[PDB]
Design an enzyme around this catalytic site. Structure first.
Site, mmCIF file in Angstrom:
data_model
loop_
_atom_site.group_PDB
_atom_site.id
_atom_site.type_symbol
_atom_site.label_atom_id
_atom_site.label_comp_id
_atom_site.label_asym_id
_atom_site.label_seq_id
_atom_site.Cartn_x
_atom_site.Cartn_y
_atom_site.Cartn_z
ATOM 1 C CG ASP A 209 -9.087 26.381 -18.239
ATOM 2 O OD1 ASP A 209 -8.992 25.467 -19.082
ATOM 3 O OD2 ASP A 209 -8.014 27.045 -17.854
ATOM 4 C CG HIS A 223 -6.636 30.723 -19.108
ATOM 5 N ND1 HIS A 223 -5.656 30.954 -18.302
ATOM 6 C CD2 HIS A 223 -7.245 29.853 -18.496
ATOM 7 C CE1 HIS A 223 -5.874 30.085 -17.081
ATOM 8 N NE2 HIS A 223 -6.918 29.425 -17.323
HETATM 9 O O1 LIG Z 1 0.140 28.063 -12.213
HETATM 10 C C1 LIG Z 1 -0.606 27.195 -11.587
HETATM 11 C C2 LIG Z 1 -1.977 27.707 -11.672
HETATM 12 O O2 LIG Z 1 -2.018 29.231 -11.834
HETATM 13 C C3 LIG Z 1 -3.351 29.611 -11.844
HETATM 14 O O3 LIG Z 1 -3.101 30.896 -11.807
HETATM 15 C C4 LIG Z 1 -2.989 31.547 -10.281
HETATM 16 C C5 LIG Z 1 -1.871 32.238 -9.940
HETATM 17 O O4 LIG Z 1 -0.877 31.418 -10.323
HETATM 18 C C6 LIG Z 1 -1.656 32.929 -9.049
HETATM 19 O O5 LIG Z 1 -0.416 33.524 -8.900
HETATM 20 C C7 LIG Z 1 -2.732 33.792 -8.474
HETATM 21 O O6 LIG Z 1 -2.704 34.393 -7.602
HETATM 22 O O7 LIG Z 1 -4.037 32.939 -8.727
HETATM 23 C C8 LIG Z 1 -4.023 32.325 -10.121
HETATM 24 C C9 LIG Z 1 -5.470 31.586 -10.257
HETATM 25 O O8 LIG Z 1 -5.537 30.520 -9.368
HETATM 26 C C10 LIG Z 1 -4.040 29.100 -13.171
HETATM 27 O O9 LIG Z 1 -5.264 29.834 -13.343
HETATM 28 C C11 LIG Z 1 -3.755 27.861 -13.321
HETATM 29 O O10 LIG Z 1 -4.396 27.559 -14.724
HETATM 30 C C12 LIG Z 1 -2.326 27.427 -13.030
HETATM 31 O O11 LIG Z 1 -1.687 27.721 -14.355
#
Ligand SMILES: OC[C@H]1O[C@@H](O[C@H]2[C@H](O)[C@@H](O)[C@H](O)O[C@@H]2CO)[C@H](O)[C@@H](O)[C@H]1O
Ligand SMILES: *[C@@H]1O[C@H](CO)[C@@H](O)[C@H](O)[C@H]1NC(C)=O
Length: 431
Positions: A209, A223
């Protein structure tokens, strides 16, 4: 899916530049193509829908193979139906157009192949205007390990290919994708919204990303997945983080990282005006076979070169680039499991970049999490004061899709001046 002929498919032109140290930058006549999930799908022999609203026609589509044999993807009115336009070098994606919400397109080398970007020991640069892209929205520019032909060579059931935007995958192993592996994803089809559902399969691959943002907040996030290329999943292989893919990623959002005044309206990177975003993929030995070791970010606005903000969190070294060590440190500091390292960290992300990736550009809202992970407090059950919880200043009630769709439907993002090539070659400086 079959290739429909009821509507001509004309891909908007979106020129990009490929740059080298010695030769400078040269234009490529690239195009963009709408992703297959957004298209009309109808009987090969006429006009009857295979999919309407959020359900499949079980007559045309009693199983995935029968459906793909019976059903064609067709051409798109880019502006009229989807709010997608291009000047030839600048792509405008509008949020709501009639009953359509959002879009995703891929960069094409020609009318039947995605542009395959190999960005190890290279950089990717673009301009963005988020002036009309508010809380709750995401204008995303990113790489997925899709096949250049959208899967046509691998899957006999897919006769549509890249020309119709097939073959999507990403690190979330999404199960809402309608065609996967040349079969309609109709098994256990479950409605999730007025226009969407999920089936029994998902589609997984590594994802970089480069840019997810709105005028409040921005993040860049590798990722990795343990697999190589687009992979259909079922059952727990699809599961977020524990399955094939690192769904969370290792993210750098300047605000989440402890600098609340770096990026936003009227800030150092002033999101009320256009700016340039450079992302560099460095290897341990500065070759295209080395191990991805650092992802750097530089901004440019009003001719000012702006280095990325520094991390300011206890237990996290004060750095301004993504490295394996930064990722371990922030994950420990924020209390998050380092699924990123479990999937192979930057080295695994780098092997995907080396194999070649497809560029996607999108505007979307977030039915799962209201984009709060980007621009608000997240998760919603944690103390906003704990390290990592606060990611922007948008209200914790913001971003519910039904809200933004009615309130700010004419939101848009503009992506332009797309360039890639040798490190330090897509931009220049002088005194
Ligand atoms: O699911 C929504 C969103 O998640 C981001 O990952 C998170 C996460 O869910 C979380 O628990 C955490 O503490 O921080 C993360 C980073 O913001 C993902 O990066 C995004 O792609 C979505 O997938
Ligand atoms: C790799 O390039 C970086 C500049 O980005 C430099 O600091 C370093 O010395 C180079 N390393 C090697 C092995 O040449």
């Amino acid at each position: 899916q079959q290739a429909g002929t009821n509507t001509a498919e004309n891909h908007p032109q979106l020129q990009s530049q490929q740059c080298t140290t010695s030769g400078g930058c040269k234009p490529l006549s690239t195009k963009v193509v709408l992703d297959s999930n957004w298209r009309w799908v109808h009987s090969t022999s006429g006009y009857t829908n295979c999919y309407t609203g959020n359900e499949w026609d079980t007559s045309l589509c009693p199983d995935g193979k029968t459906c793909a044999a019976n059903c064609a993807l067709d051409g798109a009115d880019y502006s009229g139906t989807y709010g997608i336009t291009s000047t030839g070098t600048a792509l405008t994606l509008k949020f709501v157009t009639g009953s359509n919400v959002g879009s995703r397109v891929y960069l094409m080398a020609d009318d039947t192949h995605y542009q395959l970007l190999k960005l190890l020991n290279q950089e990717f640069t673009f301009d963005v205007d988020m002036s009309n892209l508010p809380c709750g929205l995401n204008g995303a520019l990113y790489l997925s390990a899709m096949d250049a032909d959208g899967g046509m060579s691998k899957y006999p059931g897919n006769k549509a290919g890249a020309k119709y935007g097939t073959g999507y995958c990403d690190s979330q192993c999404p199960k809402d994708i309608k065609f996967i592996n040349g079969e309609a994803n109709v098994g256990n089809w479950t409605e999730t919204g007025s226009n969407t559902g999920t089936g029994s399969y998902g589609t997984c691959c590594s994802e970089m990303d480069i840019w997810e943002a709105n005028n409040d907040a921005a993040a860049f996030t590798p990722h990795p997945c343990t697999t190589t290329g687009q992979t259909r999943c079922s059952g727990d292989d699809c599961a977020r983080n524990t399955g094939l893919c690192d769904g969370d990623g290792c993210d750098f959002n300047s605000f989440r990282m402890g600098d609340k005044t770096f990026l936003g309206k009227g800030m150092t990177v002033d999101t009320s005006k256009p700016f340039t975003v450079v992302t560099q993929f460095l290897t341990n030995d500065n070759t295209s076979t080395g191990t991805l070791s650092e992802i750097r970010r530089i901004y440019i606005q009003n001719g000012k070169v702006i280095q990325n903000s520094v991390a300011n969190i206890p237990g996290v070294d004060p750095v301004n680039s993504i490295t394996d060590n930064f990722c371990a440190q922030q994950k420990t500091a924020f209390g998050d499991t380092n699924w990123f390292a479990q999937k192979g960290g930057l080295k695994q992300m780098g092997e995907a970049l080396g194999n070649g990736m497809v560029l996607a550009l999108s505007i979307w809202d977030d039915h799962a999490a209201n984009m709060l992970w980007l621009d608000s407090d997240y998760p919603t059950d944690k103390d906003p004061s704990a390290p990592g919880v606060a990611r922007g200043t948008c209200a914790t009630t913001s971003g519910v899709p039904s809200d933004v769709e009615s309130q700010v439907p004419n939101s848009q993002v503009v992506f332009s001046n797309i360039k890639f090539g040798d490190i330090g070659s897509t931009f220049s400086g002088t005194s």
